[PDB]
């Protein structure tokens, strides 16, 4: 069988799979108090994409389509197209369009548009509230708010490029975004479908290992913590290699190439997440050149040493 590997990139060399920003650090903490079910950065080790996960880091939390202005408002409704500007088909067996945000929050970015006929362009600052009632990407439409009232044309290619998150209105400082709360992709009266499953540690004393980034903040006092189960480069690697999983768990060692020494060991579950043996909230202290190395296919009989 084709030999499994993980990328030899360092943490800082890799990209968050849930927002288009670099990874900064590794974090582990207890995850019992909430349901961990992100839909981006979901991939099996043998390359099967899950949830709303797609290959390109720049497409994460983007939207594409045409827009209509809502009368008397600074708001626009985008009728969603695919990443290639073709039609979006809601009957496809996915939670939402690939790359749709998988958390409840207010995402600020730029909404940009080109007029096909003459190549005239326009762009305005814009926010999407993924917890709002008109956030129905599964149905093929979402709403944006701007400061403009009169500028975007109908039936012209329009793009949302995410930049950061904001906190404002009725929420208290750092109470939003809520990274572990999924939006209702079809809106209020419809339950989500075809979700990548929630993940949790199974063995006692184990915790999830998160790949963590700090989201840019554009207004207010947002919670800028963003944790993903897999770096986007791992998703890309697994998808390409598509190496068959020889067990439920790949044993990874986090190694310092300067000294050749192993820092700690961890389990990469074939369904695409990592666990370590630790109790409590902990930011890992890692050397700048450290990376993960796949050492063996193991099983439940193998016990991780406490890190």
């Amino acid at each position, epitope marked *: *069988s084709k*030999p*499994f590997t993980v990328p030899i990139l360092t943490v800082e060399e890799m990209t968050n799979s849930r927002f288009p920003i670099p990874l900064e650090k590794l974090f582990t903490g207890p995850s019992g108090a909430f349901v961990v079910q992100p839909q981006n950065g979901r991939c099996t080790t043998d390359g099967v994409l899950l949830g709303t996960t797609q290959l390109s880091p720049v497409n994460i939390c983007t939207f594409r389509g045409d827009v209509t202005h809502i009368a008397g408002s600074r708001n626009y409704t985008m009728n969603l197209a695919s990443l290639n500007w073709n039609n979006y088909d809601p009957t496809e067996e996915i939670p939402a369009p690939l790359g749709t945000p998988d958390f409840v929050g207010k995402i600020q970015g730029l909404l940009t548009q080109t007029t096909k006929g003459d190549g005239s362009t326009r762009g305005h600052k814009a926010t999407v509230y993924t917890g709002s009632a008109p956030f129905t990407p599964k149905l093929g439409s979402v709403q944006f708010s701007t400061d403009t009232e009169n500028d975007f044309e109908t039936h012209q290619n329009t793009k949302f490029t995410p930049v950061g998150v904001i906190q404002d209105g009725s929420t208290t400082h750092r109470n939003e975004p809520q990274q572990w709360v999924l939006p209702s992709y079809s809106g209020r009266n419809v339950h989500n479908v075809h979700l990548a499953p929630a993940v949790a540690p199974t063995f006692p004393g184990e915790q999830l290992l998160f790949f963590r980034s700090t989201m840019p903040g554009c207004s207010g006092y947002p919670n800028m913590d963003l944790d993903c189960l897999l770096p986007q480069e791992w998703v890309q690697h697994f998808y390409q290699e598509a190496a068959p999983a*020889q*067990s439920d768990v790949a*044993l990874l060692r986090f190694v310092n190439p300067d000294t050749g020494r192993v820092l700690f*060991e961890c389990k990469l579950h074939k369904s695409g997440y990592v666990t370590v*043996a630790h109790t409590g909230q902990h930011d890992l202290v890692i050397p700048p050149n450290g990376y993960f190395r*796949f*050492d*063996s*296919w*193991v*099983n439940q*009989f*193998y*016990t*991780l*040493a*406490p890190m």
Partner: nanobody
Amino acid sequence: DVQLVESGGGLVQPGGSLRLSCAASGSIFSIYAMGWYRQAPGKQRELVASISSGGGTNYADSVKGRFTISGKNTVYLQMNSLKPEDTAVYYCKREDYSAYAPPSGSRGRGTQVTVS
């Protein structure tokens, strides 16, 4: 294949102690786990204790505080404060792991431990 030679075992006085050892040889890999399962007559097989090449250990709840496993490709089981309910056949088990294939298991013939 892999060969496991088990040592120790026998008849023990209750409240007594016994030490088991298991040595592995043959086509062994550098990443592995080793340990013991036991089966009493008319009972389900149960894990007793295991140790991994990285030093991680696992103990059955039933033997916590009484048994110690330690690991040369030989592992040792120190069984203390033995009670009649510990009477069983004890089987050494090894899993050998690689980057290229599924885990490969080997198991010893087992040794009778009788506490009475």
